[PDB]
Amino acid sequence: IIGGTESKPHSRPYMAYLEIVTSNGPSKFCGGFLIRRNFVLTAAHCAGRSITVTLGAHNITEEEDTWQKLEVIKQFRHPKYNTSTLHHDIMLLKLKEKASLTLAVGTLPFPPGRMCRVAGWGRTGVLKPGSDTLQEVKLRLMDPQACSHFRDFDHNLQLCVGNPRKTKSAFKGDSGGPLLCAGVAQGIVSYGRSDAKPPAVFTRISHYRPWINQILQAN
Ligand SMILES: CS(=O)(=O)NCc1c(C(=O)O)n(Cc2cccc3ccccc23)c2ccc(F)cc12
Ligand SMILES: [Zn+2]
Numbered sequence: 361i362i363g364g365t366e367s368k369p370h371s372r373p374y375m376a377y378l379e380i381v382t383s384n385g386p387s388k389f390c391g392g393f394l395i396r397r398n399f400v401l402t403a404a405h406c407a408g409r410s411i412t413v414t415l416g417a418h419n420i421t422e423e424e425d426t427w428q429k430l431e432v433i434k435q436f437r438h439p440k441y442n443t444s445t446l447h448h449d450i451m452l453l454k455l456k457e458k459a460s461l462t463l464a465v466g467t468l469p470f471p472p473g474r475m476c477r478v479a480g481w482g483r484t485g486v487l488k489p490g491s492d493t494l495q496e497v498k499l500r501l502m503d504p505q506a507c508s509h510f511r512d513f514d515h516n517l518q519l520c521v522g523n524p525r526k527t528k529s530a531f532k533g534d535s536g537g538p539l540l541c542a543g544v545a546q547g548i549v550s551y552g553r554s555d556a557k558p559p560a561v562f563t564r565i566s567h568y569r570p571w572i573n574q575i576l577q578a579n
Contacts (some may be wrong), residue, residue: 361480362556363528364497369418370426372479375399375469375494377417378453378536380408389490391537391549393468393478397458399576400432402536403548403563404441404451411453416464419493420481426464430455436575438568445512449550450563451536451576455570470569472541474501476521478549482533486556490533497528501541502559510561517567519547522558529558 376392378400392402392413400413416426436452459465479496483489500523507513507520521539522529528551530537539547539562552560565572 361478361482361491361497361534362485362531363526366497367479367496370416370464372494372496373416373462373466374538375417375465375479376402376404377414377420378402379412379414380406381410383409389481389533390535391482392453393538393545394459394466395468396469397461397467398455399455400455401538401572402451402453403550404437404449405443405446405550406536407435407437407451408466410461413453413455415459417494420484421492426462428459428465429523430457430459432456434579438571446551446561447512447514447517448563448568450548450568452572454579466482468538468540468545470545470565472501472544472546475499475539475548476501476539476546478521478530478534478535478539478547480530480539480549482535483531489499497530499523499528499530499539499558506559507561508520517552517564519562519564520559521547521562522560524558526558527556529556530560531556569576
């Protein structure tokens with residue numbers, strides 16, 4: 361998160377930190393969010409061989425009594441996910457078991473106004489480290505025209521997020537995190553410019569509600 365603030369600890373109790381063993385070799389990290397006791401929503405590009413989800417966290421180097429760490433048993437990557445265009449960058453994760461609902465661990469409920477918020481443990485600048493602590497930032501939902509420079513941008517599938525006159529943005533490390541507008545999840549962090557210039561591109565959750573509901577009904 362660029363230009364944001366450290367979240368109040370445990371104030372976003374749906375947030376999930378994902379550790380992904382790369383089908384090749386080492387680990388990578390993404391965000392995600394708990395939508396049911398045993399389901400997490402994240403980006404398709406975060407997929408890998410095996411996934412661990414950490415719930416209840418604030419500082420990821422600091423185990424607390426709030427933590428619940430759960431193995432993913434099934435990855436449901438969107439079938440039309442396209443590595444080239446990055447369309448349908450969405451993925452459901454089934455947890456080996458149900459999370460205990462606590463103050464620090466909770467599910468996120470399912471058109472938006474302009475001001476939204478996003479959280480994550482990603483980089484705090486172009487060449488900065490990832491954040492040990494959960495950061496958050498308020499961002500403006502932009503007209504699709506503001507993202508016309510992204511060749512594969514499709515208003516039906518995606519949100520255009522972040523006023524270009526400011527540095528405030530999701531960035532690398534924030535993939536899979538939810539965009540909330542008025543307490544409702546509208547978006548999922550997907551991609552943007554490598555120079556961190558807003559806006560960035562988020563998956564439009566509403567378009568995928570049939571598919572989500574389908575997987576939840578069958579699992
Ligand atoms: C660890 S991972 O599983 O996420 N893989 C690396 C990766 C990232 C990342 O580091 O998060 N992002 C997001 C991202 C990238 C570059 C610029 C961005 C500007 C804004 C927001 C997000 C941005 C990807 C998008 C498409 C993709 F195929 C791979 C990646
Ligand atoms: Zn704490």
